[PDB]
Structure formats: structure tokens, C-alpha cells
């Protein structure tokens, strides 16, 4: 099962995803739509039977049509009045099984609802209070606020501190991406040694480097 | 609109042990055509869904025996008799008896491991950020175990839930552990009218909360 289809809506707007059925005739078997949203398990959104009626998650029914063209093999995911906890995977699927063949998933789409154009992130790096308490390992981090669309690269000293590095999906809040990330490191290497955050960001072009300095 | 109830939400196995997961339907799961649909699915990170068991007990092509499925009416029950480390990720449960058809709410299968605290440290706005009149305060947690962890922040000695933005690792392949960011944001005035910020986690591991503050003042 093949999808195609935006990745990016913006919030008023549709969502139409393609879904090419190969192997199996529409005419015999019918397709079901799942989703799931980022924090969240998956989710039934409706069925078009081979027939070609169908039903629908009461939630969805009154702004989604799933649709079909027997002779092409295709389904569409058709749903109106997108909104930001719209933004999921969109999976195609055979369900309700009888026997092992002929029950595949599409691939899934990614589709992402935003109204924000290409931004580039502000990058802000984090050292600790100043009363904050030394062990031999101290913890800095990095904040990667307000960029949009995904995704972000981000590195410690380009790379070479990969081990004691933690970075954290990306949430998407009023349109725009955030996320954190930290490292952890030898009281002994920081702040005698420099400590450097490095962002990139593929959509804009653009590259960040931060110097993680003590507050003063 | 049948529910369908997934137990435990969690599941700690180590590898080799017997592991069960349960789903409970609010309706009978009904036949249609003779076929009782009740189907279980895994989805490991980065993947799609794979069906395992369908109609209830079948094991799908490629599935290994480990996994076996029984129930009928409301109760049913995913098996694996040896639990291998291809099997971690989370397990759902389906139902295509009643239109609208239903998952459960998922059962997440982990590695377990011995507990361990979480490594908490708090950060105050950056100046660069607060020049742009926004405030963020970022505590981090981690490498903790087990994943049941409760963050709350306190400003002045009060609970505050708005702007509080949350994200969370899954379990580190090297050390089975997890790791989690919370970030409280304001604006820069809103942050300005007070002085003590302070990230509370409250973790089996600590009979008391493990806190870590700043106050303004002092940065
Ligand atoms: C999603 O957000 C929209 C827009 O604010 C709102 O109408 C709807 O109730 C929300 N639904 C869910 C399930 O969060
Ligand atoms: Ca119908």
C-alpha cells in the first residue's frame, strides 16, 4: 500500500491523502484509515467496504470522506477544517483479518498543521544557577525555541561529545517547534574547557553555534 | 462507542520471562459471518503497526509460537511465553465487531532494570532569551528508572500547570533508562514578578520529592 500526500496544512484548511492499493481488488477487500498523534496511541478513523459504503469514527464523521476508484485502485483520505492536534501518521490499512495474505499497511504520512512559514530557531544556551552546586559532573543545555518545520541537528562541540548528550523530541506549540537538549560533562572539562552547542536547521539554511558560558 | 481497556499501561519484563497483557471490551465482541475480529498489534519505535494474533487466537505468517491470543465475550489475552528483545514496544488491541471500531489505549513492553534516581537540574531563562521578552525555565530529569515520575513546578512556594511543555525519551538501548525535559514558560514580565523557581519530581526511588531551585535574584 502506497501513500502519497501532503506533509504540511494549514489550519483552516483539507487534508487529502492518496492511498494506491496493489495485489488485492478494492472490488473484494475494504481499506481502513488509522492516525496516530504524537504523545498518543493509534486511533480508528473510519472504513470504505469493498461495496463502497462507508462508516466513520463519530468524532470524524462530520469533516472526513474516505472515497474510491475501483478501476485504479485508489482510496482517499479526504477531511476537512484541519486543526494543530491534527498533526499525526495517517495510515492506510487492511484490517478485520481472516487469513495471513493480503493484509499490509501503507508506509504512513506525516502530515503537519501549521499556519507558520520557514523560521529558523532561537538558539539559547543554558548554564547552570550561579549557586548551583559542583560533582564532579555538571550538566549543561541548550534550548531550540520557535522554529518550524522539523528537523533540527543539533551537536555538542561538533559532535565529539555524543556520549552524556540527551536531546528531546520536538513539541509543537502556536505554530512552532520546540525543543532541549542536554549534555552532561566532567566538572573538570567545563567552565576550564569550552562547551559549545551547534544547531543546524535544513528549511532556513542556517547554522548556530553557542558557547555554553557561566553566568557571571 | 466500545472501550477498549488495556492492562497494565506498562509492563516491566526482563528477557526470557513469561509476559501477559490483558483487554477488556465495555460490549460483548460479537461474530460477524462467523469471524470473531479481535486482533493485537505491535508497534515498535520508527515502525508502522504489525498485526500479530487476528481473529482472537491466529497467529499471523511470520509470527513467531511465543505469541499466542485466547479470550471470548469482553476478556481477552496476549501471551508471550519468552519474552526476546524484538518484542519491546508497545502492544494494542483492536476490535472490528461494532462500528466505530476501537483500539485499546496501548501496553507498553520494557526492559527492566534496577531503579535509579533521576539526575535533576534546573536552568533559569537565558539573557539572550529574555532580551527577546520571553522566559523559559528548563528542568531536566535524567536517566531515571522505573518511568513513573510526577514533575511539578512551584514558583514562590505555589503550584503553577500553564506553560509547562513536557517531552520524554524512550528507553536508552545502552542503559535502559529514561530521560525527560520540562519546560515552564512565561513572559518576561510575568517571570520578573517573582524570585523562587523551583522543579519538584517525585520518583519511587526518594520517600521525599527531589527538588532543585534558583532564585532570580542571584543570576
Ligand atoms: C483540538 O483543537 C481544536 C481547536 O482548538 C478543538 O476544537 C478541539 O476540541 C480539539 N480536539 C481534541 C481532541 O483535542
Ligand atoms: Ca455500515
Known amino acids: 500500500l502506497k501513500e502519497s500526500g501532503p506533509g504540511l496544512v494549514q489550519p483552516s484548511q483539507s487534508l487529502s491523502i492518496t492511498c494506491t492499493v496493489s495485489?488485492?481488488?478494492?472490488?473484494?477487500?475494504?481499506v481502513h484509515w488509522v492516525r496516530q498523534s504524537p504523545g498518543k496511541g493509534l486511533e480508528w478513523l473510519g472504513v470504505?467496504?469493498?461495496?463502497?459504503?462507508?462508516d466513520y469514527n463519530a468524532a470524524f464523521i462530520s469533516r472526513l470522506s474516505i472515497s474510491k476508484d475501483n478501476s485504479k485502485s485508489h482510496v482517499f483520505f479526504k477531511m476537512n477544517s484541519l486543526q494543530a492536534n491534527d498533526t499525526a501518521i495517517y495510515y492506510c490499512?487492511?484490517?478485520?483479518?481472516?487469513?495471513?495474505?493480503?493484509?499490509?499497511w501503507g508506509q504512513g504520512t506525516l502530515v503537519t498543521v501549521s499556519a507558520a512559514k520557514t523560521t529558523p530557531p532561537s538558539v539559547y544556551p543554558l548554564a547552570p544557577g550561579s549557586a548551583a552546586q559542583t560533582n564532579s559532573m555538571v550538566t549543561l543545555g541548550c534550548l531550540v525555541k520557535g522554529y518550524f518545520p522539523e528537523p533540527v541537528t543539533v551537536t555538542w562541540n561538533s559532535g565529539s561529545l555524543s556520549s552524556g548528550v540527551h536531546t528531546f523530541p520536538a513539541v509543537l506549540q502556536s505554530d512552532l517547534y520546540t525543543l532541549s537538549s542536554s549534555v552532561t560533562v566532567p566538572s573538570s572539562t567545563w567552565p576550564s574547557e569550552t562547551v559549545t552547542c551547534n544547531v543546524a536547521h535544513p528549511a532556513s539554511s542556517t547554522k548556530v553555534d553557542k558557547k555554553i558560558v557561566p553566568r557571571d | 462507542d466500545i472501550l477498549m481497556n488495556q492492562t497494565p499501561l506498562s509492563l516491566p519484563v526482563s528477557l526470557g520471562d513469561q509476559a501477559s497483557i490483558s483487554c477488556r471490551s465495555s460490549?460483548?465482541?460479537?461474530?460477524?459471518?462467523?469471524?470473531?475480529?479481535l486482533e493485537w498489534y505491535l508497534q515498535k519505535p520508527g515502525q508502522s503497526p504489525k498485526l500479530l494474533i487476528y481473529?482472537?487466537?491466529n497467529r499471523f505468517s511470520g509470527v513467531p509460537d511465543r505469541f499466542s491470543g485466547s479470550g471470548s465475550g469482553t476478556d481477552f489475552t496476549l501471551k508471550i511465553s519468552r519474552v526476546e528483545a524484538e518484542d519491546l514496544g508497545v502492544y494494542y488491541c483492536?476490535?472490528?465487531?461494532?462500528?466505530?471500531?476501537?483500539f485499546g489505549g496501548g501496553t507498553k513492553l520494557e526492559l527492566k532494570r534496577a531503579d535509579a534516581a533521576p539526575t535533576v537540574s534546573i536552568f533559569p531563562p537565558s539573557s539572550e532569551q529574555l532580551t527577546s521578552g520571553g522566559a523559559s525555565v528548563v528542568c531536566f530529569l535524567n536517566n531515571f528508572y522505573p518511568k513513573d515520575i510526577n514533575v511539578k513546578w512551584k514558583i514562590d512556594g505555589s503550584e503553577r500547570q500553564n506553560g509547562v511543555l513536557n517531552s520524554w525519551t524512550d528507553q536508552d538501548s545502552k542503559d535502559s533508562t529514561y530521560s525527560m525535559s520540562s519546560t515552564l514558560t512565561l513572559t518576561k514580565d510575568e517571570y520578573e514578578r517573582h524570585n523562587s523557581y523551583t522543579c519538584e519530581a517525585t520518583h519511587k526511588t526518594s520517600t521525599s520529592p527531589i527538588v532543585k531551585s534558583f532564585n532570580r535574584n542571584e543570576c
Open positions: 483492536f476490535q472490528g465487531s461494532h462500528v466505530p471500531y476501537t
Open positions: 470504505i467496504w469493498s461495496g463502497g459504503s462507508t
Open positions: 495485489g488485492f481488488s478494492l472490488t473484494t477487500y475494504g
Open positions: 460490549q460483548y465482541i460479537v461474530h460477524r459471518n462467523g469471524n470473531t475480529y
Open positions: 490499512a487492511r484490517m478485520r483479518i481472516t487469513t495471513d495474505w493480503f493484509a499490509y
Open positions: 481473529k482472537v487466537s
